[PDB]
């Protein structure tokens, strides 16, 4: 019982990050990127009107 | 989810263990009730002497 729960365990370890996470966090810096984005527009509006 | 398949197998494992400990302790019972019968064949010696 002692093998199996070191094995789960290491496996658990080495694995670490899987893909959904990574895909996790870069769609939020993404969409902080994207957020950022829109100041020169903004401004770009304000002046023409 | 991945959590709660390592306690599952905790708990396997925990239930292997105790149904060994069972042999074990009936074993146990058996050397015992020997005793008691060697207890009496000493008693019937003493009769006999």
Known sequence: ?49 | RQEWEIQRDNADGEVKQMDAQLESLKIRREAAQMQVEYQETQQAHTQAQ
């Open chain 1, 1 to 49: 019982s002692a093998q199996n729960r070191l094995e789960k365990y290491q496996q658990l370890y080495d694995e670490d990050i899987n893909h959904g996470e990574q895909r996790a966090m870069s769609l939020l810096d993404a969409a902080a990127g994207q957020s950022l984005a829109g100041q020169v527009l903004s401004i770009a509006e304000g002046v023409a009107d």
